[PDB]
């Protein structure tokens, strides 16, 4: 069994820099690539004692790629994997989807083919992108189009960064998010949202870090992915695979948008004075003070939830804890679904990396749920996208690249149709 | 890979560019001889954007000096970092236009501009992937305005798909060095609105104001003004030369700040800029950079934005900073003073951070705001243009060279509808 | 002297036209 | 068992200067080479660089033949005027080299057809070797001029006039271009500014990989007589595309996981052919795979199965068993200063197809255009030729084009 | 092995040859006293191509000075590298022709040409494998043009298989020293088209123009012009004297650039040529050498090649360089500028690389383009020739010496049919 991870854009490959850091520090591999069998899902073995990750970093701007070529992990990554363009899409979805995308995605495809050929029991792909940019949005959707026509039956775990409601860095990002979701809708099988303001609030309150940079954000994202692949990498008392989430969490082929959370995100000092058990982390995974997307599931209704458990966890209390959640009335599940949970326990605790701000915790929970509060975020995006589109601001850049007015209106009504779809399943 | 060819025109362009090449070369650790003597390997990774290695550590700047009188060319080779320019890049006429836009655009331009074009072609094909061109000039003079603007038009019809920056100081009544300033400014702006991708408005009045209050200088010669302008130019293109947590290139800035193809006149400011008497009493955090950035008395134009409305704005930060702090400060200054911002565009501010500070400071910033208040300059200039042209003052020096009267009326109409069209989106 | 100016103008025009022709030929080769 | 090597011209003996460096560095197994060589040229400048070089004492002084003055990119001059005085001395030595030998497998000739010495006296040497021995194999590894990258002007005249004898004299003819090798060094070896030395080093790798079966004991050995049957289905169709894998640098080699399956694939993509032609336009008539080093017969067996079941490339309708495998135990050696890293195993593939029918057709127009206006013809005619042999060599390549089109159907 | 016998004629030939033997003797490391004093081994094994070992390490050049006035011989013997020739080789008449082609071709040559032939024969069979002869003369003067031309004809009668190089300067009306330039140049070309093997055409306009524009010399005396011509001649026969990755002798270049037997007039250029003030502001790469090579303002003839098409072209490179860059650069200029090249000939560029640079440089190049723009000068000459000959100006100075009217008509006929065949092949 193998899974390969592709990274597109500035935010994508930065996230990868934290993930592969965490991976080698977990499996005891130095950054040069040699040990001083469970690593087979992510690293292929040269046979000379060197381990190479199954990943391809690609983007349109060579700046963020070439610090990676000269960091500590210069020798871990195979050179061909770290694809790099010559000029940026520059926060322009059309420029990444038709002008510059059309030259770079074909090189990525004939690369990713031999990664899959080296694999035997490929479980799927998992993609990392931020929709606010042009690279991660434009050629990301283009790459997903060509991936669906190539494989189809294989899972494509989309861990996307949506633009925050209020905290934003770009100004044309409403255009980019709407047009990108229009294709991310019918290509990604399972798409997980990761906002930025929510992670900002977690590091401010939980980690009690008052001055966080992007490093800490990417660090905890890797922690969630590690908690999600431990079931694939290691044996537990009750394991799930990546094909399990395809069935157990998305009731309709167009409702695939999950709210992620993780617990406990605790600094080095609270852990010393605080107690860890299964019941309280089962609680802490549901409160909105620990969610990764600025929305409130208290406003929505749950379809189905998923629960990753790591460390010294027995199965009797995960059942008792999820029972206590159902008997509470702050959160309610959809009428059509009497049972709304998918639980899982694995033996290996989360390892720590030196230099990170995550404590060594005895046990942890990674929750991945599906709800209807996600419908409020998409609607919130439509108000400010439609706000500017009527007066045709910033449209001239995209239409000058080779697009027209047609795709704005047709993409707009498609995501508008999705709004009505979410409201009718909730009833 | 991403590359900027630099073009300096007229006397104003030559001094601005001279202090500019000293600042960049000192950032990359290249001594006046032109040989590498720096220490960090990071300084070598991104010298292809502005320089070419010649032989044995010799780095030559990718610049072209263009003028009409040899006083400026000799003043450049005399000063330090004067021996680094390639002598063939001193493309150069002999007669002189002399504050006559028609002489700068029709008589002497017609035989010098083929030469400057040929140098630019060699400099553009010598490199691989053009990011854009960078032109520094004035709008009052003749050899900078008319010739430089013709160069802009010729280049834009040659390479239409590349960006182009032009930094232009504009005349104002309080700093009135020549007498025909409006006749030059109005015709120059007419060509800039139809050719340049984006312009960065400057003026000498605001620069004098900055040197009085903020710098508290005793004797602000032109060296200090060129020093401020150079710091701005280095600050905006720092993203291509150094890596950072959130990189923002020139094209990324252009599409993020220009909502409509005719609205491309920006006012610029730079921080920190403090006197030596108060530089000791200061702190270096993000809020102190912002509330000195967004101050109206720090803009480098005499167009107070609170007399208008902000369309979009941008900040380019340099130094090891926390991106959360960057975004929350832009959020605070946009929520409090909500009236000063445009209403049908939320989150009017584009922001970026780079991880290399300039030498001598620990943390710096650079502000680029596209307000609608820039129309104060257009009305302020057009009335002086009208006041002479209703009565045909100084006209024969323009008329007897090839220009006729409908050129002035067309130029008047385009400037007048431009300030009208800024007012409508306001 | 007049005919001399005609010579130095026709050649320059001829030269510009030849350069444009080369560009068109180059584009055909790349596009094919 | 021994095989002797002849080197002609500026290109021939520079290729040999790298090839023999590899042979001495690689080494009873030596008996097939230890040298049994002859350098010969009309210009003394490159031969006398060997005479004073590091390998002064290695070569017997007589071996290094050298004329008085060059043929100067003139096939007629190097075939009729100046060849006539040096070729007799050369072949009357090669004879006593063969009399020194007892179990001669064959001769192998190195020449470039663009020049006059490599082309002219190449064919002249070949004609007296064919009438003297006949049965003994003569492998000719020639260097044809590239379509777009080119150093000379009259090379179409030379290449056509040389080919007319390369048909019916050599037994097994391997094409090699310079643009294709330049592309190989640019793509795989990532050398952006290569020179002739790097080209000659990897040409020697191909030669060594096809004679290692005679020199060293493998799981499945293959002699020079084996290529004679297994790859040429018709007496006049012997022109072979070449390829090699893994052509890889020193750092990339450790990072990647070289194995038998993927290098059998990599030896089949047109991104790794030694001749600038696209075999997607053609159909494979036969393939030959030399495996060196750490090879068990199973994975080579499994690899040819996957190639046959793919549809990106097709075979002729005639051959269900369109392969010839060969396995040798000793891994390929490395040269200090060389760019190829040490590998446990390597593959040199020699195929035969109809893609070669494109290069001749491409060649025809360039020769045709110049000949119609009688360009440069006065040089060759005053040398001793006539208009007869120009037109008749032209129609010989026309026949070859129809021949490939007929067999490919 | 391969042997080059040198023959110099007239004032122009003697002074050009003097500078030539200066630079060759320095290349082979021979002192002004005639003894070897070089450092590298490479400089010894190929001095027989230009020298003869006499006794005690005395290497004397294989040259023949030839003129009719003693001023040039004494000036040669006076200066350095003047005491290295054999005094028997200073074959020398006494009366002098003086810009009269008839004197140098029928009257005064008749008593000198016997003695030169005696010396050149004894000097030819002294070596084993002759490669060819190398002549340096003019086409405006009398004892250079007329006697040198007659010597060319007699030599081609005796040795019809051996090669022949002629570096000849031609007169142009912008630099017109004598009055009878057309009468001489027209008759001289009539003999060159049938006797020489190839002629590398030179002129003083391009030489003076080159030292003005590119070299930027202040006072370009004949020493510098003769220095440039000598550098060309050393570059054309560097392949024999030094080993390289691809060799190209005289015959090799001749067959690749001459597509028809009467089309053997070349244009020459040398690179790199840079001012002393800008020598350190540049790289030394193959693309830089190519840009300076294919510049039309760099030929050493006053004939713009962009006024016609190239039939063929040749580039001899010297230095440690990658052959791929050589072929890619030649292919690039062959595709982008497609109209300036002939169509029914692909590959109009032959290239070659030698491994030994000239002394003091890292990498050099020599260009020999056989273009069809050379026909302008023949028309540029024939129009002057007809201007005189329509009206028998100066004609009696030649008529009373032996030439009849049919000789001048024949010279016009050969000139006219030649310019038609260049026009035909364009
Ligand atoms: N969570 C998280 N988001 C990031 C990080 N870095 C950048 N981003 C997000 O990425 C968005 C913009 O896209 P980028 O990835 O930076 O740029 P891009 O997607 O490659 O698009 P271009 O700028 O055109 O190349 C911003 O809105 C940020 O919120 C990071 O380290 N962590
Ligand atoms: N691969 C390779 N090809 C070479 C080398 N040297 C020359 N060539 C090829 O040889 C062709 C010309 O023939 P040369 O070998 O250079 O000269 P020649 O064959 O001896 O003929 P002459 O010049 O008359 O002596 C060119 O097209 C080159 O491609 C080399 O070192 N390696
Ligand atoms: N900032 C700055 N402005 C200058 C400098 N020198 C001249 N100027 C401006 O140039 C304007 C006059 O333009 P001028 O130099 O004559 O332009 P030109 O003749 O076209 O080159 C004045 O308004 C000055 O403010 C300088 O060193 N620094
Ligand atoms: N380059 C160069 N040209 C010369 C030199 N001396 C004379 N000439 C040219 O030769 C032409 C006159 O030739 P001349 O010396 O009279 O030839 P001669 O009388 O036959 O020896 C003039 O046009 C000069 O430009 C010299 O030393 N160098
Ligand atoms: Mg040769």
Residue numbers in the entry:
A (entry chain A4): 2 to 37, 47 to 437
B (entry chain A5), E (entry chain B5): 1 to 426
C (entry chain X1): 119 to 150
D (entry chain B4): 2 to 28, 47 to 53, 63 to 437
Structure paper excerpt:
Dyneins are a eukaryotic family of ATP-dependent microtubule motor.
Each dynein adopts an extended and slanted configuration on the doublet microtubule in which the motor domains of β-HC and γ-HC closely associate with the heavy chain tail domains and auxiliary subunits of the preceding (proximal) ODA. This confirms the “overlap” model first proposed by Goodenough and Heuser30, in which the large 24-nm globular repeat of the ODA is actually a combination of neighboring axonemal dyneins. We show that neighboring dyneins overlap, with the motor domains of β-HC and γ-HC interacting with the IC–LC block and N-terminal tails of the equivalent proteins in the preceding dynein. Therefore, the ODA complex must also transition from a crossed, inactive state to a parallel, active conformation when docking onto doublet microtubules, which is stabilized by association with the ODA-DC and inter-dynein contacts.
